[PDB]
């Protein structure tokens with residue numbers, strides 16, 4: 227469980243992210259696809275993209291980037307009380323998209339990388355540690371629902 231001080235660090239840097247949700251979303255998905263190519267194969271919608279240039283030029287990729295960060299932001303603002311927002315996400319990613327928990331670890335790493343690159347002043351080590359804990363909490367609760375369904 228995160229303390230109030232840790233949640234405040236997480237939400238302070240997230241407020242900066244909301245100033246440009248589309249730019250952050252695109253950077254995060256591209257970072258994920260370049261670092262872990264097997265994740266791109268899960269998206270029939272984006273598997274035709276081969277180079278980083280093509281990825282940056284895709285408006286549809288940018289759109290999905292917004293969807294991912296808007297959903298994640300709603301969860302973080304609940305400060306742990308995210309049952310209602312996390313349940314539908316877990317169901318779709320386990321049974322429809324078939325996304326292993328390991329790929330959620332990969333995207334958490336991309337998020338931390340991008341936040342460090344765009345906000346060095348508000349994302350020091352203390353904030354990095356808090357963000358890492360918030361994403362672990364996110365994964366732990368997703369994994370419990372995956373286990374229930376048999377994934």
Ligand code: HEM
Pocket residue numbers: 265266268269270271293294295297298314315318319323325329330333
């Ligand atoms: C921070 C993590 C993530 C969040 C918040 C997130 C959020 C979402 C949301 C809101 C949708 C649309 C509604 C739904 O289907 O539930 C979606 C769709 C999808 N997600 Fe995720 N997602 C995340 C991670 C991943 C990862 C790591 C992968 C796989 C490498 C993945 C693959 C998909 C796919 C395949 C779809 C369908 C895209 C389409 O419309 O064709 N997601 N995700």
Ligand SMILES: [N+]
Pocket residue numbers: 309310311313314
């Ligand atoms: N829900």
